[PDB]
Design a protein around this ligand. Sequence first.
Ligand code: NA
Length: 183
Amino acid sequence: GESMAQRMVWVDLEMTGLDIEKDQIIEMACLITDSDLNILAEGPNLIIKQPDELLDSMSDWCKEHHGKSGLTKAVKESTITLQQAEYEFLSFVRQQTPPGLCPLAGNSVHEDKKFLDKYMPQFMKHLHYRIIDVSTVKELCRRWYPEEYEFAPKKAASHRALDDISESIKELQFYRNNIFKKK
Ligand code: NA
């Protein structure tokens, strides 16, 4: 029971931008780890259809980055609606975590939570309200462990959801192994 309740729901999203009032989710991936960051199950890794007009009006940063990664083209070709994507992720976490008990995890994953609370509220209902923000640990590492901070793994920062989740886990594992108290 406690082991199940101590799992983590790792999620990373791509969005058309950071404006919660207009922007939409275009990519989502999800991994489950145990409390010790071992990957237990790989969830859906989905590209969500959104309208051409929204993609055409994205910021220059988003056009450049989602364009070169292939994501923009894949969004235009997608047949996955937001609602169907949500169901895939909700079904996955229902198979993997007890209801209400496990947190979202990722780098600045509160931004993903802001989008998910609005656009996948039933998925979020399965999760705790707390988060495991790897960037909180990053910012504490930078302050309290500046020497160790220089050794954190370099990120490819490809802005593709599943690859970025994996790098987030690796960053948190680095902090656990290097700035937390030794047993
Ligand atoms: Na992210």
